[model samples]
Target: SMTSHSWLCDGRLLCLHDPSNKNNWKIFRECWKQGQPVLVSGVHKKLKSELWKPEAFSQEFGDQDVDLVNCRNCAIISDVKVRDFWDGFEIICKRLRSEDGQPMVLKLKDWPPGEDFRDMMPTRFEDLMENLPLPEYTKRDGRLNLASRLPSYFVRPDLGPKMYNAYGLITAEDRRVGTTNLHLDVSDAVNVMVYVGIPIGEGAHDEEVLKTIDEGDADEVTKERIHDHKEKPGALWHIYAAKDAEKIRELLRKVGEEQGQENPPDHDPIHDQSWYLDQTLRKRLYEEYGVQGWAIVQFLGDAVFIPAGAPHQVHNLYSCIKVAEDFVSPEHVKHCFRLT
Candidate 1:
């Protein structure tokens, strides 16, 4: 679970590529308005990197990717390899699920041949980024993958998969999918998820996946998909989209004090996520304090973006494997700066 850093900002979830256009990169940077989450799916299949492969069958990927309580893992992987690796891993994870073990994190640590497992990261990430209008301050490997860690001025009390990869020498595992939390990072970023393992729709073909699991059992989702009676594979991400950084900050200090803290907590529930906050608390932020947000689902092969300073979180719809990288928009660095 390695993350590439950049500026985060609100934008539309658009197509990864336009057949005749090379300006996808230009379009990407220009994307921002409405303070919403952006989903860029339907990536073209063409990975030239180390593990270039085909989309994995979702059921197998979801089933094999990790242990019941484990989430996140691995270096970038792609195609059928994504399916096979996830399937095989699930077989082991299945055994783990049966045991009633405590929550665990599956570590996918390594790099492309030189550092990690030979997994597949979707190539469409390559597509959407081919022409990105990123600042020249960033490196240009011509490899096009954003796997290195970025710089930051503050130490977050508690960080996610990305924080552990600070040295950029490790690709944290937790790759076995499904989740999110409310908080903002040091940079702006666009997250592209390639559902190589599962066919990422509304599970229109789920009946088929279930029937195949066992001919007579129609309770496919409940019987096969649910593991250890605790996990469900679904994908939805939420973000606080209002553009006023100072306003958001004021709410933070206000809420921090209410939570009995002199400073903001690791995940300030009131200021970080307005949706799941106590009703009166959320109302206070929105009606009195004036905070607002946006929520969206990340389907198979969908690439989403979180604007710099926009407090956001995600919820996965299914147990799935995905490759996501972040970026800093030289254009919005100041925004993320003020955001914290």
Candidate 2:
């Protein structure tokens, strides 16, 4: 069991070879069967444009309206123009302060808000879709992606090639804020980080990092180093195997009970975005419950392949723009049926 988590807290994951190598897919399949997340690096090389960057996005879709979430409570705080958030971001170089003087920890999460990111921005989406990293592995209709085989009507709303963007929290005080909460997905997903800002105290400025990427001369190793706070400039992920999910649920429930939240709205702890298991919680979970999960530090240009039914959470360490596509994999199609 420990061997399954041997990659814990590592900046990279099981697969780091170029996808065109053919043998890399075998390793990815092994990770999938183990219900372990695989990380594929050097994906940015697949993209022909830097349109995934924040400055580029701001220039293109700044006038588009977006829903802003308050990271503190996971509540939608306001509706504002995309440019407003980017302008505020440029001036503050940190989280925008709210009227109450608290660090707002605002996140602009829902741009190109629906399954229509492709329909809405045809040219840009086509550019991205055409060069999608590891297409033979993650793309719909691929041999491994069972989701593509399903009848369109049975799936109801289409699954997406969604876009996610957010500013990173600078201090420990805002750790886990403006980031994803613990949750489970019904289908397998490959989330790719295309751009990452230089984290605070990382010894370089965001502009410098942007320039390195823009010039297209930065090698894979150098780009990987620039993203790391201690390791890379991407988000951190905690992923539990589908088998251990019930155990995790029990642990969260016991903790919730202690805090007098006997029955949260839907009896779901993972969906609430309320609890982020810090070091303390993780320690207790391991020592007390004998539960362990993979700790991954996802770097820029890395694609994280999460298996179906795996419960996971993410905390971004710097400003980032990521794209995710969900598909049903042959090995885990049973979980999708159960989840649905």
Candidate 3:
């Protein structure tokens, strides 16, 4: 994954494939209303100079169309037939429906033809890291300086299918003011719902809600309350029953263990193999296991229960920080959990 300071703060979309200067980097949006320049020092400056500077490409271009162009410099502009370049690259987008009866869309460009990009990308992790500009790490940060080697974790091709490209909820402003509606993907194994920190209504305590479910014997009303509370900001809920929770937990533990083995011990901090395992395990549970359960981690977000045949969607309650784990068998999964 390419990390760009400009993208994080200024909303510029930085394509990792572009080995050009920062200025030549393409901005996905047509315009930047309030963008700012990024600060760079030391090796970053040198790297940027070598990668983006037009002079560095003089030998490659041989004084042909050498003028510096915005979002075009260092770009492979020729329609040349290179041995490695596939001429059949294509871009495709999918339309989906959200729980709120809205349309959400996922747009992926230059995805490998025919095969599911999500599945192929994880397995061919090394291909994804070919142009990864890793960040520098210092030992003073209470951790080993391993940022240079961080890209190695993404090199494996054993990781399972990824269910989502990007996920988030449609805001009230988007609903009322915006013209485009959102869509949810019901086909994924796990559908995640997220509740933003912004408070909406009186949040119900989990224990209180559980007590009500137990004492009142009001299943329908309790379910409705839970669903409503989850949609509210600063509130969270999963639509799964208690019976499925144990299975979900077991699967998570198994997957985590498997991931732990694939990842190196020294890379534990940045690459949480266990977390990756849990994510893959949950996805697999939705894909393989008959039982379904929603997973909720407080103040973070919740993932809805998506059975094998069920449609699914996810909303990111917060910025996602996930490690991609290689898929493993049930035996290895169980052992990984034991080690953890």
Candidate 4:
């Protein structure tokens, strides 16, 4: 059927249809090096077999004939440069029900802001207390009526203006625990973080868990685990010891050194110690080794470009809601090893 030489080693005659035995043939290798002749043989005594029959699989089509449209385009926002446009959007809070029907208060934030800023403005606990009748405990634990409690300015009306809204919830257990939830949101005009506490728990263990979430699959189970961990007030201390922070920092420094070599600048100390490549390195490793994914636990106070469709799970280390929008492309889908 076909024949070609192997590239691994020079010039060994390989045959198709089992050339070793003339009667029956075997499958031919797909690619061949340049200049290799393709010869055909047959039993008919009257005619010469065709010497060259262009590779059976090669075909060409004009650019117009190809379909280049992709789904990644649908998810991209070229002009919207802000995060969580629906931050000021109103949402109804409900109790999370366990498999056993146990009730836990769940907080939600609507995303992709819809009509009317008047309805979407942040519903703070104090405002809710003034306007509506809510349970005393829910009023006390502002997580239940989060709309009124969260600062108004942080919830912008123009961010992520879309049809579908994003929602967040702090489960019942998290309220009972004095976990420090942290949130960060930034736009062209404003940048703010609603951190409930400072550097709570062991930073090392927190870093480890952040790594896990960043690298993990974006499924319900993984999301739930991240939520559970974020809600546990002192869980970070249990996971990483005080000594672990130094170890984590040292590891980051070593990674920074390695990255500097690959992306060298003309000057030495091209990047400051504060400007390490932990996120970029992890992303590269995930791409090269086909690891699931990882998350950034400690914010280095820099902008990290999260390519589109990079399926990630975000968790709060303290009692706060973090918000951001993702942009994606078709290449992101191909590189998303977990989906494949």
Candidate 5:
């Protein structure tokens, strides 16, 4: 019996051409105008150094204590040194081999806590910011980005260059447990896939194959048939348009009602990160409201560009490290205002 289910989907997010191509920004702008997410492949290859790797963190901040958030309930489970967390990360990967074992999905609470990475770790921050895996026109300091364009004296409530580090996999029962959950950010953001650590062994990489095993009956035939899949492991993203925010709210409310919640949190259901929207709910959102979204498998070296106010969710297929920077784009500034 396999614990993880298939989160991969057939649909791929729209991909942009080579970042070096001068016209790539034009393609990205078109997608941004329409509130569509685009995947820029091989961006990680442009990174000047290997500072983004998980091991680099262990080397730099291993002795520092940090809060680990349990993804199952979004609770801060414990405080441990950065090195121990990574050490435990390896142990959980091995424990995942057992069918009865359900491991905890834990993440460092926004590396460096609430302070900006630049203020805390200037050297590493300068390296990353200077060599961002994005076009000059889309980087945080780009002239087109409002966060950068505005004067320092002016109010800039939306700006972020944060590191998000988490470890774990989909559990035996498909619950609302993953790297992150359904939520909408107030500003346009680009998340870079820094690293992904897949478990060791034959069936570890075979999510598509392992997901097919019947729950109660894992026959010998199925066991023997499982093999390593060639697909690269990374986080899965489901992004919905900003216009469909109301429809999504309606769908969530209806589902909540069905689940016996007389009053669902309507102030902003998608922002709550309370639901995982498994296959059944996804089908209901499409069939019932005609709302369809882009399902993207973000691989290593890829940068996923998300427009502001878009309702999106992420599920990591393996232990992954990513860094996301938010900016206020002119086209999506309206979303920022509303969400604020």
Candidate 6:
């Protein structure tokens, strides 16, 4: 049983070296076999030291790693930075400046002589777009986890990278501002994040979530008014444990709709928006849906996994470089299909 707070407030745990082989199938299935989120480790080991550091990556791949075709297709990039309504007494607007975006972007097509997004910044691009030593998970058990059972998803840059950020990496900053908003993936995507830098602090409906960048630590800053732009000393991930897909979606919709509305009443349970937790959704989850303080996980390098229907969110402490990839396991095929 998962007993460590470091282990996702007790979510399932697994480690992977090779996933496509039948020998490792049991451990891979152990990740989400129970339809619960898993905290995975050892994913980016090969690419970590070689591709983890920002300057190191540029030195190796530079901008040449991605060709024109994939650049137009799979390669995602973003020049926009998130704006926190922090450093102020109150939030002027009740939303984030930018939504969540990952493994997709533009502007990489046109780089200066010595610049390219791949080398220029740390990125979590989708697997197999270009020379990204992608994993060899051929749905190892095609009989259990195949294309027909799992929907084939791609980094749809055309829909705008911000539309979906279930995967990607960042050197300049975390994927979203206020706290990557809440949302669920359509498949069993094992999220791998290598924190090349310090992680930010996170909170649920507690003071951390409601306080500003400067005031979040107000409880500890009792003697003096601390002023800063960085997150506190810890990081948190709010993950719903419910295994039912339709039931989770129903609770989230009560909060609001998705598809990029200018300013929806509530935050996206699967994207970015904090400083204001979804009381509407939380209330229902607790009172009617039989839920409670969600499974909270702290950042522990490459040690994370999001079960098929587990809605989640994040609040980083500072500008960080993270590399992530999404994978589907036969164990959660039924969960992934239900959302479709």
TM per prediction = 0.48, 0.81, 0.21, 0.23, 0.80, 0.47
In the range 187-296, model 6's lDDT, one tens digit per residue, is: 54444444324222221222342343223212222112123523222234556654544455555555444533345444343444222234445566678777654433
Better of 1 and 3 by lDDT: 1
In order, the Cα lDDT scores of the candidates are 0.38, 0.66, 0.26, 0.25, 0.65, 0.37
Better of 4 and 5 by lDDT: 5
Candidate 2 structure quality by residue, lDDT tens digits, 1-340: 2122223234334755463455566556776787777777667777755666566767888888778877666778566788866654433544456777765655786778877788777776766566554466566667766675766433321557887776665555555343787888877788888887654434344554344232322234444555553445567677878887777777899988888876853477775656777666777778888987776656777788888778887776666678888877777777755234
**By the TM-score metric, which is better: model 2 or model 3?**
2
lDDT by residue (193-266, candidate 1, tens digit) is: 43323333222544433222232111223243234543232354556664654565666667668777766334
The order of the candidates by TM-score, greatest first, is 2, 5, 1, 6, 4, 3
TM-score-wise, the better of 3 and 5 is: 5
- For model 3, what is the alpha-carbon lDDT of residue 189? 22
Encode model 3's per-residue lDDT on 1-340: one tens digit a residue: 6443222112322222232234422342122112111112112222222332212222343333211101111122233222111111111112233355543422221223233534434433332223212211111111212222233322212222232212222233221111111111112121222212221222222344343223212234324534675532211222233234445445545554675645333332211212221233435767876754332222222222222111122223221211111222111122123223
Candidate 3 Cα misplacement greater than 4 A, ranges: 1-124, 127-163, 172-294, 297-313, 318-328, 331-340
- The clash count of every prediction, one per candidate, is 57, 5, 16, 35, 0, 18
The numbered model that scores best in lDDT is 2
Model 2: how far residue 24 lies from native, Å? 2.0
* Worst-scoring 10-residue span by lDDT in model 2: 1-10
RMSD of each: 12.4, 6.8, 20.3, 29.8, 7.3, 11.7
- Across 153-268, the per-residue lDDT of candidate 4 in tens digits comes to 33322422121111222332232221222111121111112122222222233444444333322233334534674432211111111122333434444565666645332322
Best-to-worst lDDT order = 2, 5, 1, 6, 3, 4
